[PDB]
Design a protein around this ligand. Structure first.
Ligand SMILES: [Mg+2]
Ligand SMILES: [Mg+2]
Ligand SMILES: [Mg+2]
Lengths: 233, 191, 150, 159, 67, 72, 199
RNA sequence: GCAGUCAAGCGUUCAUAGCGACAUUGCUUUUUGAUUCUUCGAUGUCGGCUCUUCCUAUCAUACCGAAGCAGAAUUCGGUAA
RNA sequence: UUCAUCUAGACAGCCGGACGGUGGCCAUGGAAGUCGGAAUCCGCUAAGGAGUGUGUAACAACUCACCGGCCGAAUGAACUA
């Protein structure tokens, strides 16, 4: 037998979806542009399912598509001599990220001022900068990790010391019964490039210093067959 | 299938030079000079411009083609060593008997002496290789730093320092003593 | 040895009847896939759009031979449309185009061994269910071409 | 801080002794009184008996303002409204019985503010699915099959 | 301070390489490569020397440094 | 030492420092190692190894077929 | 194979030697007290069934060797609802001719009040046949026992009225009164064992 | 060994003509470690003394691996004559 | 040799999501997807298991199944000799 890599063993319940889901998304995007007059190209980059099942609940009137980006651009026909409307190639070439298509019909300034509001908190912003400088003290570490009160917390579980040391490069021992690092080590600081290690440490210490806010690229009305650009960051 | 031509590519940075005559590579950089004798592979090196070397095999089988990427990785590790360096860090733990580790000069040869490992009367001696430097990192308890240009020499010296003190005829779920590598990185860790 | 000769007779009989059932099954498969134009011109009770006019003289049978030849053009067209750009074609595509051209060369020489359609061969074909001995007794399997039949 | 009034939910059998063996690691270090807390927990869940229920406790300056949170397990079972299942006798209490579509729609209209479905039909389908888990029949029917019929338009559920 | 890699220079079999034939009916004469058949076989033609158009093994000829 | 004490020592002190990476590298080397034992072992141990390999392969394919049939 | 692997680790109790048995409700008390009077590995943790087995410690008083057996805890149950974990404790009390200490928590860090404590103590009154029984109020630096009520002192006198009892108080964490309790228990058992020479 | 359920290959593409590897249960209790004073032995041309080599299919000594392997003492494996 | 996947972006790798009734129902001193028996549904989805493993007294945390971004050309399984 030839030397080849054998795949890992997993026997689960879900199966892999195919081109039928992409075809159904393309048909849904064309029919949704045909039904709703206010197709808005937005860029929801870093977001948790909990926050979207909230915006989908607030704008419970319109439709939101969050498919693959190339498939959505193909449904809007990003070819320069192809379209399903009049001159939608600008709104098609606008998509350059994990794009979303909010097809509405209602408004054109309200649907661009409420979004400027919805802006709850998020995780440690692994690509951007962080603000709240945290340094754990020289004692036994705890679950909130210097973010709760004295005796209102739980000490950190023993089964995470190996992940704390051999996967985050933080000096630690055990030495009595708990984690109890010997010195005080500062994880992050204000106005610096937060790394992946710093962001994972801030997530494991459960801090929320960055804010999530929607960014809408453009909005096209099909009645006038025209796309207005915006920079609602 | 005996493919007609297979090539790999080595991108050499600004301040370093490489000289390859008969499968004998010399890399000269900002931290020193490394050399390697590759006269068992049967490859061909070619200089494209002053920033790219290209290595190739003509009419090679599967076993012969599998050595182009190891040649490329060895020369890239030479370049990375001469421009950044290799830094290994080793931490040693004990339960009852504190291990005393020192640097000695027995007829001018730079050994590591390990003593009182698990209460032994025996003194363990491990020789420092040529080019690797051993320092004892203050502000960290029970740690050693090994630094060098050659990743092979630095890793082999850390490996035999690990293997000199192993637990014999006991239970290793109970007897947690010895020296372990904890980080492999660079001397110039960024930039 | 604990085999003697009775074990050898036993394994000889079993291996023989196995091999003979295999080769017999293969020959019946070859005959069924050889006699497919007969079942094609048989089907729909001899082309049931024309189940009233029981003549089929000299141009209808030529049309039926041509339709039997090009019966599989839909899969070939679909495979041409699904054939990707930087890919060699499929073995189904190659063997089906091989079947296509090797039937068309036989069409150009002498179309297909079909029924005579000039005698009681049509009655015997309508009353010829599936047996291989319609050729043995009442075939009239005279062939035609893609022109004046002869 | 000023207050540590966090929802210390403590899913524990109701109208019983909420023993602080399961609450000492979360309250008895925060300077409470466990007997007063147990009496307040009984007085708060002094409606549901012999059936566990989720329950919070605003911790507002050593005064446990207890409360009961609603869930589709109690209301659904409490609806079933069976007899008692003791730990001192044969405890194999199979919940094999029948519920009502009116009580199902009432439970859906109660806990419509704890679901992500904007339709009473979808909320009642989720509730019938919870009842199919809890082994309670509804209109003498297998509940998943009846919910499949309702998704294929069986029941007339006004929103 | 430039890098230095010497290591080789080879005659290449490719279309246009002229070729001296070392054994056969047409020994001692020149031809050209016009097509490559496999690793070991090529198609040659030399009209002026008088060697016909033919396929041969590379082991029957020797490459020259002319193209 | 009284009632079960090795796991209490594990929870109180920890395992070795190089414990996890050694187990990962052992599982990574086992794929190369089971083919070296199929080719180097001679005599009776080779026949025993081949019998165990056949039993394991039949058991694994039976588990795969039973799982897909029962779930679908 | 399973029973051999389990039975190899099991502690060594001599049933015919000087023995202090400890007993009480499932919150630590007893394990902290054994940690104080001996050396052992019985960890102290605020949840109930931290010790799912029984442990032995050893100490020395007046140049004799004493054992001390720790107890998992008896929940609330009459006769046949108990698990094997509580079966271990009640068989230890039923079979070990020893000096038994009963631990009481007058503060409420446990989940079981003083009335349930006294009710369980009166339930396992007849389990003591020829043993020196003694009750111990623990964590008294939070709940001093003289700062009680007249609605508590009744059942406190009910656990006082038995012929074998000696109400003492301990503060095992704060290291207040442990040596005196251990010496009192050893004095009681040594007198009761020496006065039964009968040679 | 007998009897039954399987089920990958099968009867050189047929599952149920007719096989059928890997499994799996049954049958063999002085059926709660009980009885069993028993060597229920085999062996008739070899046995003993003396003395030398060879094999490895390893009992001990050397070095390793696994095990609920705390220590100590063992068990199961690898190389090795 | 036969099946599949793939510029509507396949395989490998890095990174993000992995939701809501609900801590489904019994058993348990306690087991919240992960000691067990029952079970196997519903919504929102681009997708997400009444859960594939590691884990905790029980929770947490991580991983996998499944989707998305980046990179850009062929790749995976079973079988034959
Ligand atoms: Mg051997
Ligand atoms: Mg030992
Ligand atoms: Mg010898």
């Amino acid at each position: 037998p030839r030397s080849k890599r054998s795949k890992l063993v997993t026997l689960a319940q879900t199966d892999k979806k195919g081109r039928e889901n992409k075809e159904r998304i393309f048909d849904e995007v064309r029919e949704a542009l045909d039904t709703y007059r206010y197709v808005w190209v937005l860029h929801l980059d870093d977001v948790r399912t909990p926050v979207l099942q909230e915006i989908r609940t607030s704008w419970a009137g319109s439709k939101l598509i969050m498919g693959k980006r190339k498939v959505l651009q193909k449904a809007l026909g990003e070819k320069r001599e192809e379209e399903y409307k009049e001159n939608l190639y600008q709104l098609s070439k606008l998509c350059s990220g994990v794009t979303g298509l909010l097809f509405t019909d209602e408004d054109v300034n309200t649907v661009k001022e409420y979004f400027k509001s919805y802006v709850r908190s998020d995780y440690s912003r692994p690509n951007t900068k962080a603000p709240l400088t945290f340094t754990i003290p020289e004692g036994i570490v705890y679950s909130r990790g210097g973010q709760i009160p004295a005796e209102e917390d739980v000490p950190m579980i023993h089964s995470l010391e190996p992940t704390m040391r051999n996967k985050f490069e933080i000096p630690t021992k055990i030495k009595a019964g708990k984690i109890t690092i010997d010195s005080p080590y500062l994880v992050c600081t204000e106005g610096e490039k937060l790394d992946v290690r710093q962001a994972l440490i801030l997530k494991q210490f459960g801090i929320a210093a960055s804010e999530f806010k929607v960014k809408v690229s453009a909005y096209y009305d099909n009645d006038s067959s025209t796309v207005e650009s915006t920079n609602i960051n | 299938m005996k493919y007609i031509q297979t090539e790999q590519q080595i991108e050499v940075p600004e301040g370093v030079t490489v000289s390859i005559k008969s499968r004998i590579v010399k890399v000269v950089g900002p931290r020193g000079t490394l050399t390697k004798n590759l006269k068992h592979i049967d490859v061909t090196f070619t200089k494209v411009n002053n920033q790219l070397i290209k290595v190739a095999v003509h009419n090679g089988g599967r076993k012969h083609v599998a050595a182009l990427r190891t040649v490329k990785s060895l020369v890239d590790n030479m370049i990375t060593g001469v421009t950044k360096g290799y830094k290994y860090k080793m931490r040693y733990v004990y339960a009852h008997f504190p291990i005393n580790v020192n640097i000695v000069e027995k007829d001018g040869a730079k050994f590591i002496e390990v003593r009182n490992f698990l209460g032994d009367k025996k003194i363990r001696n491990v020789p420092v290789r040529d080019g690797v430097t051993i320092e004892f990192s203050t502000n960290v308890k029970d740690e050693i730093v090994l630094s060098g240009n050659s990743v092979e020499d630095v890793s082999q010296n850390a490996a035999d320092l690990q293997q000199i003190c192993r637990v014999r005829n006991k239970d290793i779920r109970k007897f947690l003593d010895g020296i372990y590598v904890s980080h492999k990185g660079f001397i110039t860790e960024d930039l | 040895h604990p085999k003697g000769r009775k074990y050898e007779k036993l394994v000889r009989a079993t291996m023989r009847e196995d091999k003979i059932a295999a080769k017999k099954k293969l020959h019946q498969d070859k005959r069924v896939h050889e006699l497919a134009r007969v079942k094609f011109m048989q089907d729909v009770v001899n082309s049931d759009t024309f189940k009233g006019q029981p003549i089929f003289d000299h141009a209808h049978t030529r049309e039926f031979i041509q339709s039997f030849i090009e019966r599989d053009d839909t899969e070939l067209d679909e495979l041409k449309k699904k054939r990707r750009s930087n890919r060699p074609p499929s073995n189904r595509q190659v063997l089906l185009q091989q079947r296509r051209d090797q039937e068309l060369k036989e069409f150009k020489a002498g179309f297909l061994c079909p029924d005579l359609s000039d005698a009681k061969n049509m009655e015997f074909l309508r009353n010829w269910n599936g047996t291989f001995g319609l050729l043995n007794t009442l075939r009239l399997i005279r062939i035609n071409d893609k022109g004046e039949q002869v | 801080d000023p207050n540590e009034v966090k929802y210390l939910y403590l899913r524990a059998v109701g109208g019983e002794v909420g023993a602080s063996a399961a609450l000492a690691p979360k309250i008895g270090p925060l300077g409470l009184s466990p007997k007063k807390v147990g009496e307040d927990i009984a007085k708060a869940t002094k409606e549901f008996k012999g059936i566990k229920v989720t329950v919070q406790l605003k911790i507002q300056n050593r005064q446990a303002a207890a409360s009961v949170v609603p869930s589709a397990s109690s209301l659904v079972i409490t609806a079933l409204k069976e007899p008692p299942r003791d730990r001192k006798k044969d405890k194999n209490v199979k919940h094999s019985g029948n519920i009502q579509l009116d009580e199902i729609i009432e439970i859906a209209r109660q806990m419509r503010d704890k679901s992500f479905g904007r339709t009473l039909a979808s909320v009642t389908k989720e509730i019938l699915g919870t009842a199919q888990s809890v082994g309670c029949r509804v209109d003498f029917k297998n509940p998943h099959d009846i919910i499949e019929g309702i998704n294929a338009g069986e029941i007339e559920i006004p929103e | 301070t430039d890098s230095i890699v010497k290591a080789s220079n080879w005659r290449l079999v490719e279309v246009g390489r002229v070729v001296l034939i070392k054994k056969g009916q047409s020994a001692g004469k020149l031809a050209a490569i016009v097509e490559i058949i496999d690793q070991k076989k090529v198609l040659i033609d030399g009209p002026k020397a008088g060697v016909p158009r033919q396929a041969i093994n590379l082991g029957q000829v020797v490459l020259t440094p002319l193209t | 030492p009284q009632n079960d004490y090795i796991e209490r020592h594990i929870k109180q002190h920890g395992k070795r420092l190089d414990h996890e990476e050694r187990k990962r590298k052992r599982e990574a080397r086992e794929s190369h190692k089971i083919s070296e034992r199929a080719q180097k072992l001679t005599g009776w141990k080779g026949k025993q190894f081949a019998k165990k390999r056949y039993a394991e392969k039949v058991s694994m394919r039976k588990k795969i077929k039973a799982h897909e049939q029962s779930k679908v | 194979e399973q029973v051999r692997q389990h039975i190899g680790r099991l502690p060594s109790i001599d049933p015919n030697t000087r023995t202090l048995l400890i007993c009480g409700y499932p919150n630590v008390g007893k394990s902290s007290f054994l940690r104080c009077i001996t050396k052992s590995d019985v960890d102290v943790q605020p949840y109930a069934f931290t010790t799912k087995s029984l442990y032995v410690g050893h100490f020395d008083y007046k140049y004799l060797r004493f054992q001390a057996i720790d107890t998992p805890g008896i929940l609330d149950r009459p006769t046949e609802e108990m698990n094997n974990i509580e079966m271990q404790s009640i068989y230890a009390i039923a079979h070990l001719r020893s000096c038994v200490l009963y631990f009481m928590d007058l503060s409420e860090q446990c989940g079981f009040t003083i009335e349930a404590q006294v009710k369980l103590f009166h339930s396992i009154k007849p389990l003591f046949a020829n043993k020196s029984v003694m009750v111990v109020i623990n964590k008294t630096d939070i709940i001093r026992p003289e700062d009680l009520d007249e609605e508590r002192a009744q059942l406190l006198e009910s656990v006082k009225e038995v012929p074998g009892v000696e109400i003492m108080t301990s503060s095992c964490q704060l290291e207040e009164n442990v040596m005196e309790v251990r010496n009192k228990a050893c004095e009681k058992l040594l007198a009761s064992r020496i006065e039964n020479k009968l040679k």
